[PDB]
């Protein structure tokens, strides 16, 4: 008895005779869409930067303890970007901070570096902004959300408050031995859960810088228009 083979035939007729409501105070927005389709080539850790957002607990020593009268200003959505700075700022060069709980490295040897230090090319506009002259206001990205024109920068408050922040980094990261308040993943082990350069690639690097340049100029179409707006 057989499964058949190909080529065969067929015949038509004959006789083989709880509706939700909370998109109001959390969610907002409106999205446009055209026949053009919207492009992306970036990762989202670029888009949020700070890989951290946090609780009432570590801000109840901050907001409703003090923030009537902060002698230099201590707002809610400023605590995030300052507290996000330093722990990465000892990450790409000190890995051994984790396994040994007696020895997290302290800010008393972190002063002369982290005033000028870099959260992965952080002021990366300026090597393009020093020619694009957009300093008459501050710089904003499309992955800059609308929360930050009304905020303050960082490097000037270390003159003001900078030695009162890491003091509360220390006393809850270790009771699981080295995890952020939102810990990473099943991150550690994949078990269970719980001769070319002579004629061709001499041309490796130019073919972006010749396009890193005139994009300013085709955007100098509008960047010269900001006095036509005035």
């Amino acid at each position: 008895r057989k499964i058949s083979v190909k080529q065969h035939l067929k015949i038509y007729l004959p006789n083989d005779l709880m509706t939700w409501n909370e998109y109001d105070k959390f969610y907002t927005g409106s999205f446009q869409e055209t026949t053009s389709y919207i492009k992306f080539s970036a990762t989202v850790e670029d888009c949020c930067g700070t890989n951290y957002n946090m609780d009432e607990r570590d801000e109840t020593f901050l907001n409703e303890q003090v923030n009537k009268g902060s002698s230099d200003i201590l707002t809610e959505d400023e605590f995030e970007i300052l507290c996000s700075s330093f722990e990465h700022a000892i990450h790409e060069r000190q890995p051994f901070l984790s396994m040994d709980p007696e020895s997290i490295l302290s800010f008393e040897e972190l002063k002369p570096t982290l005033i000028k230090s870099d959260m992965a090319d952080f002021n990366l506009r300026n090597q393009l902004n020093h020619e694009i002259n957009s300093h008459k206001t501050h710089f904003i990205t499309q992955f800059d959300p609308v929360s930050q024109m009304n905020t303050r920068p960082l490097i000037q408050l270390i003159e003001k408050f900078g030695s009162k922040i890491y003091d509360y980094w220390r006393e809850r990261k270790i009771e699981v031995n080295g995890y952020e308040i939102f810990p990473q993943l099943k991150f550690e082990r994949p078990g269970e859960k719980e001769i070319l350069n002579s004629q061709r690639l001499r041309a490796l690097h130019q073919e972006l810088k010749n396009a890193k340049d005139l994009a300013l100029l085709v955007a100098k179409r509008e960047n010269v228009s900001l006095n036509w707006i005035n």
């Binding site: 010749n210 396009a211 100029l217 100098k220 179409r221 010269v224 006095n227 036509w228």
Partner: peptide, 23 residues
Amino acid sequence: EQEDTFDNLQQEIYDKETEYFSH
């Protein structure tokens, strides 16, 4: 009093057009 870089940029893009993706 406002066109001082508006005044030249709008042909040079055709030169860069004829620079790298016109071979």
